[PDB]
Scaffold this active site. Sequence first.
Site, PDB file in Angstrom:
ATOM      1  N   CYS A 134       0.817  -1.191   0.000  1.00  0.00           N
ATOM      2  CA  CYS A 134       0.000   0.000   0.000  1.00  0.00           C
ATOM      3  C   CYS A 134       0.845   1.233   0.000  1.00  0.00           C
ATOM      4  O   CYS A 134       1.720   1.409   0.809  1.00  0.00           O
ATOM      5  CB  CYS A 134      -1.013   0.002   1.145  1.00  0.00           C
ATOM      6  SG  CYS A 134      -1.839   1.537   1.454  1.00  0.00           S
ATOM      7  N   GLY A 135       0.582   2.074  -0.970  1.00  0.00           N
ATOM      8  CA  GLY A 135       1.322   3.313  -1.128  1.00  0.00           C
ATOM      9  C   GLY A 135       1.105   4.296   0.006  1.00  0.00           C
ATOM     10  O   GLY A 135       2.032   4.996   0.414  1.00  0.00           O
ATOM     11  N   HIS A 136      -0.121   4.355   0.519  1.00  0.00           N
ATOM     12  CA  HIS A 136      -0.439   5.281   1.605  1.00  0.00           C
ATOM     13  C   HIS A 136       0.045   4.769   2.957  1.00  0.00           C
ATOM     14  O   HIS A 136       0.180   5.541   3.907  1.00  0.00           O
ATOM     15  CB  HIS A 136      -1.937   5.566   1.660  1.00  0.00           C
ATOM     16  CG  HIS A 136      -2.411   6.507   0.592  1.00  0.00           C
ATOM     17  ND1 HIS A 136      -2.074   7.838   0.576  1.00  0.00           N
ATOM     18  CD2 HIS A 136      -3.198   6.293  -0.487  1.00  0.00           C
ATOM     19  CE1 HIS A 136      -2.637   8.415  -0.479  1.00  0.00           C
ATOM     20  NE2 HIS A 136      -3.319   7.503  -1.135  1.00  0.00           N
ATOM     21  N   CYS A 137       0.296   3.465   3.035  1.00  0.00           N
ATOM     22  CA  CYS A 137       0.765   2.849   4.267  1.00  0.00           C
ATOM     23  C   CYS A 137       2.260   3.101   4.443  1.00  0.00           C
ATOM     24  O   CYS A 137       2.784   3.054   5.553  1.00  0.00           O
ATOM     25  CB  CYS A 137       0.468   1.357   4.240  1.00  0.00           C
ATOM     26  SG  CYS A 137      -1.096   0.934   3.444  1.00  0.00           S
TER      27      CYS A 137
END
EC number: 5.3.4.1
Length: 452
Positions: A36-39
């Site tokens: 996950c990019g936002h993680c």
Amino acid sequence: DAPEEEDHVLVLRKSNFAEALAAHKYLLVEFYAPWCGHCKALAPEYAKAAGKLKAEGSEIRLAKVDATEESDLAQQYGVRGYPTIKFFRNGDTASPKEYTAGREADDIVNWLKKRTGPAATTLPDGAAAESLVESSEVAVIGFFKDVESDSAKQFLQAAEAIDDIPFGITSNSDVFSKYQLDKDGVVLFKKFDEGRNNFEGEVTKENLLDFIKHNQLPLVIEFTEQTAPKIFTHILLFLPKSVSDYDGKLSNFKTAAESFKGKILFIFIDSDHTDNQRILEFFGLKKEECPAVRLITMTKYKPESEELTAERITEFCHRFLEGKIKPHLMSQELPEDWDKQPVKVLVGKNFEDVAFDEKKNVFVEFYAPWCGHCKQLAPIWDKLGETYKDHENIVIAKMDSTANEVEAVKVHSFPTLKFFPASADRTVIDYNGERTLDGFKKFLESGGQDGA
């Protein structure tokens, strides 16, 4: 203090999770997936927040779970994407608050600080007391001269078990006298109805929670669509503001509410308003048809008389509470032409006795008018009717499945062609074959055993 962790962030597996739940009264858990990019962006900010709590000596611990590695731990929390941050008080898995604010370290920290610590705010003076009351629709204040008593401890145990309500506790006797109390006791404050309820009996957690559960919520409640989740057996009063004796009829709706508390939820909605439309059309009503009443449970019901005293609205509830009132099914007015043309028109009232006729082979087209696919099929369907207009057992039908609802079969995609053979067992067969007159004819004569 030698548990797995990264940058002051606890690494949680499914083996230790509940161990950290008990060993940490305030546990903030971030559910992340390594792709996950936002993680990725939250990760150093999530750890930066954990280090700042550490520096202050805070007891709040931050943890994380690799959803790809546990997988069953994301399933057991209804996790719907990443990152997902849940806050756990007292290791209670029943009421985890989801974190939905900013993802910078300072945001996360300020969020934690405002909801950690004991659930009961200590009140030294009438200022903090009346402030706690004014700060929420419903507030509970415990009055205990000896704060070490079981009554005081059971009160604090009850405060921790509720998060949707602010709790207050005092020993100051100027407060006792202020709120008209001469002895120890618990008082529930609310900004509706009587405005105040006093607790009676043994001051225990179980009795305190029950006392609050029954004394929150107004007798009748104003309906707002944002309240719809929390609100939803309910009786819905569609009451316009313009009407006469509004207050009188509202009063009648409240006195009837006194006799069904905990069983039926009394809700009055302003029909004259413009935001009560999704729901006013959900029940198939119009502002002109109001004032109106609709009881539900999805099973909905509808009163006999149209008047709104206390006795009639009450008995209506009683009538429903024992059958004595049939479910109300939405249905058009059955036009007298309905069967005077090759294609018979169906609505909610006749459907069952028409479609499930034991001596008829009923072919029904469930439709909607804006459905281009159901207007491309309209001429072909009328031709199918004219072909079988003088047939003995075959009847060609169509029903608007919007304005009509039927218990027998459900339809939400149009056009849907269903065939009801002439038998006793209420058999139904879908037609998913060629939408042609040749296909319709090939399918009907062949009993339905060939086609679709």
